[PDB]
Design a protein around this ligand. Structure first.
Ligand code: UD1
Ligand code: PLM
Ligand code: PLM
Ligand code: PLM
Lengths: 346, 346, 345
């Protein structure tokens, strides 16, 4: 059974949103548009859902103003918003599954905080978390169970650090950053001096890592500091689980890096970039703004222009689509040769 | 340390032997490396090289492979069961397992007043059990592990140190979780805005880990927005694997290390995923499908059998295409052999 | 707070190095060769750069004696060394940026140490680290916050273990070994016996993990133990972030494994081997000494002689470079066929 029941109108009012349809319609859960039934709230998200909308049995559909002007004649209950539909849907989702926390509010007796560390107002620090010398945790932060905030590291207001995250020394974490469990920020970069015919001597890496506002970093993802320059991750970028970011990597604004991709040292990535799952980018190159790399891409040279790329080495997608096809067509090209090899006349 | 004779072993294992029964054995070893004091085993068409000239004092072997080598004057232990399983029986005679030496519930374990901890459970130093969690009987919760809000761990499960189990996770019976794993990380899903900017969505689905599942070190399993992610019973998952939001892994399936499945993909029962393979989201993998290491699965696999390559094709077809790509200089030379016969002048 | 400025001459005296140029030149930081300004010390270690040298604006360039001869005519401030310019550069770096510890000296009161664990002199153990029955921490070792040192595991003198590393039971860690946060040393190997109905039997692992001296291991890298014999990483090898080292893998000496690479069971890597980022190596094979594997390599067969290998399946550099070129050429190739086929024989 469900947690709550709402009428269309009651919910529209709660959401400070407009509605069209039957205000007395009863709503008791959420569902994706292709599976929603009378009782369900759903949303339309701007894709080929034309016929997904007409055939929708949902009791309430969250739709933007522009999209509603186009489907005004349809006999459906709409919740009409100026915000993005998915975001308003999120608000409806949390009426049915309320978000929950660990049950340890404020600073826990077992939190270890260095006397020189500065903790601001209204912060939560969970069991066994460690805050090292001269660190600075901004107001309304959450430091999860057993996380380490390293020496001289700053954490901007409203950031949410999950359990067992390690933030090493000299790391700048911006406002409203979300780090999932098991991330390591400011691990030493993979750089050495070579000696005695190939033996490798450790170099101390003294660069920072700068994590700007509204950045998210996924579970077990590792971000290496530069040797003397900073690794940076700019505003609004999101980074999925299990990603390697190497020393002195720059990742521009509102970029996205999907699980298990890796970027080698000293590479810059532009703004509005998508790096697909398991892709890899060599060191010492650049990726332009608005580039999209397909999963499992291997980037060997700089990309200087926007568009989709894939393969290894990466090529513009038109080129590798062609490549895969010509390769698959090899036997048919060989029978084409053998037939033309048969013609050996006088 | 103890010692066993060939007859003294055959009788314990309840197995038939052949050779010198008074032979003295004192350990296990790999077929190539085993001397007189060593028990070994054969379980390959591709390890037969090392049998003809082995020095083991006992060779565990199947009724099938025995038919090839019974003429050889080696000491055998012949089984109608898995040679490797019987091998394990011998190995567990010579090496004992060892624990931390922190029995029961440690004084430093933080258990929220509203959590339920059953009987005969071990919770190691600095582990944190959050509100309304249920830890079943005969469980082991490793040092510094987190058991999130409203999460349950079925009886006889084993959570290694520094594992993070987040909110509303269901861990089934006799599950083993290796160190560093993160169960119930947030799925990589965002709301894109007017200016290409990405808005965080709290993911509120469950992760359901069924009975007998094992999960490797530093592996990450994401939860769906509101629908569930599932790893069905029997499935074994290796190190450094990404399991994305709302993925469903069928029963008795294997996912090898560094492999990755993208959001909303369903994997059938008895599927093997070779290492470093990635599979795209929103597709289906049929039961009994085997993906080779480094496979790149772009489209749903409808039929069972072995697949490999990127894009994924059946074994026979990629093996073929690898051969035909290798043969391109030959193919071009026979075009040069043909562009030379333009000697057709008049 | 090292807002510090030194003179080129002071620098040279500190470093014990010859200089060419204005000794009064004021240096107040470090920079990479193509960005260095008059306030900046930089270095040239690779001839791969050197094109940035002629135009360089650095207030000092750390250079070798050979390179000086090559570039003598030039009007630059040089610090001339018989050592590695990158190792001399490091001494300058450390002059402007000072390493910082956590500020938790010695053994922190909240460290759990089993009555049967052995702790030597001058050891740091940080808040909430856990040391199990019969473990051994060497002299002058650092055990970072919340790290676990498992049952009967030894950590050799002068090792540095960062926060939340899990060192499991029966792991030997050598001298001077560094382990970045989150690595897991001694997880169970991935070993099973699939039954007729399709179900998979867990095989208990009781072998060990041996990490030799001067080895380094990256963040969240995971090194599994063997069914009955040890996984081993030999002297001076450096393993990057997020790597899979399976059960019974042996890594030789002075080898390097770049991030996300992976190696399957019972595989042998020789000495002075480089495995590139994201590369993958099957089980039960060997890689010869002095082999270089390109990034994203898929090695399916043993490499038995030295050199450079790339692609998936891996081939020597020559065969793989040629293959890419020939695949790249298929439209041009069938174009030659398209021209041929319009014969009227
Ligand atoms: C993959 C990648 O991107 N770089 C690799 C390469 O870097 P490489 O040796 O080229 O230089 P690194 O990036 O390691 O050194 C740090 C910085 O020094 C600067 N610099 C380098 C040489 C020089 O003569 N003058 C100078 O100013 C470079 O711009 C670099 O950003 O070999 C190192 C040897 O272990 C690895 O750590 C690095 O991962
Ligand atoms: C140049 C080799 C050809 C194949 C294409 C390879 C693309 C590069 C993949 C490297 C993975 C990046 C991992 C980061 C490692 C690090 O630098 O610390
Ligand atoms: C169309 C894709 C081209 C290549 C095919 C390779 C399959 C993709 C591999 C990606 C694996 C990573 C999945 C995690 C995704 C996530 O968490 O959002
Ligand atoms: C066509 C041949 C397949 C492609 C080549 C892939 C080479 C192997 C890549 C996977 C590495 C396996 C490491 C996983 C460790 C483990 O088994 O636990």
């Amino acid at each position: 059974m469900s947690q709550s029941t709402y009428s269309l109108e009651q919910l529209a009012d709660f959401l400070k949103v407009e509605f069209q349809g039957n205000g007395a319609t009863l709503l008791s859960g959420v569902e994706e548009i292709e599976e929603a039934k009378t009782a369900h709230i759903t949303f339309l998200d701007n894709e080929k859902y034309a016929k997904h909308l007409k055939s929708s049995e949902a009791g309430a559909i969250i739709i933007s103003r522009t999209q509603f002007q186009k489907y005004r004649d349809l006999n459906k209950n709409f919740l009409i918003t100026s915000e993005s539909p998915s975001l308003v849907f999120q608000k409806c989702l949390e009426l049915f599954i309320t978000p929950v926390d660990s049950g340890f509010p404020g600073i826990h007796p077992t939190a270890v905080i260095h006397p020189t560390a500065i903790i601001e107002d209204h912060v939560c620090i969970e069991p066994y978390a460690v805050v090292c010398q001269h660190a600075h945790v901004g107001s309304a932060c959450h430091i999860g169970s057993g996380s380490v905030i390293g020496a001289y590291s700053t954490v901007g207001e409203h950031s949410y650090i999950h359990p067992r995250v390690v933030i090493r020394e000299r790391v700048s974490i911006g406002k409203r950053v979300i780090i999932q469990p098991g991330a390591v920020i400011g691990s030493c970069g993979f750089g050495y001096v070579t000696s005695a015919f190939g033996q490798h001597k450790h170099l101390k890496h003294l660069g920072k890592v700068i994590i700007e506002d509204d950045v998210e970093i996924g579970a077990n993802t590792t971000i290496d500091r530069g040797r003397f320059k900073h690794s940076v991750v700019r505003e609004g970028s999101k980074i999925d689980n299990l990603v390697q970011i190497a020393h002195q990597v720059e990742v521009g604004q509102h970029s996205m890096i999907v699980a298990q991709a890796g970027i080698a040292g000293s590479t810059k990535i532009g703004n509005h970039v998508i790096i697909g799952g398991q892709a890899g980018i060599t060191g010492h190159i650049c990726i332009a703004d608005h580039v999209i790399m397909m999963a499992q891409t291997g980037v060997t040279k700089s990309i200087t222009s926007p568009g989709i790329y894939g393969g290894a080495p990466a090529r513009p997608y038109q080129e590798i689509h062609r490549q895969v096809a010509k390769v698959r067509n090899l036997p048919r090209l060989e029978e084409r040769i053998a037939a033309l090899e048969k013609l050996v006349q006088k």
